């Protein structure tokens, strides 16, 4: 036998909406992929590359001098118990993105992973790898 665990609510592949009126009326649209079946969200350019670099990105070089205030906040110290606030200082996040092949969010319900952008402000999302071998790749 091939099957796997039935359901009837509301997502991506098995639907296509949305949670009650909030501050996003709309309909993202990013790329799944089975990493479950090859690995995770790292091959992906099929049609990616028209929006790498959608706005101002060849003047970024001042945007790693702030990879030293990335613990700038608390959350380095409330770990035990950081509420994740991933919307109101979701800004604050601002990694090395320069050095960062994935641009996807992993979100954790059956078996399936997402990668196309950055939500501007809505609440569709959940996990996002950035972070990725710019360069050195060893077994640190």
Sequence with gaps: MRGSHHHHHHGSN???GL???????DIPHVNEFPAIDLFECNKLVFELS????????????TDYEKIKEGFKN?????????????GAFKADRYKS??????????????????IFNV???????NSSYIA?????????
């Design 14 to 16: 098995a639907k296509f």
């Design 19 to 25: 949670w009650v009126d909030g501050n996003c009326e």
């Design 50 to 61: 028209a929006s790498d670099q959608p706005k101002q990105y060849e003047q970024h070089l």
């Design 74 to 86: 608390k959350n380095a110290s409330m770990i035990k118990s950081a509420f994740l606030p991933t």
């Design 97 to 114: 993105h320069g050095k960062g092949y994935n641009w996807g969010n992993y979100n954790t319900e059956t078996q399936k992973c997402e």
């Design 119 to 125: 939500k501007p402000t809505c609440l569709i999302n």
């Design 132 to 140: 990725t071998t710019a360069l050195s790749h060893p077994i640190e």
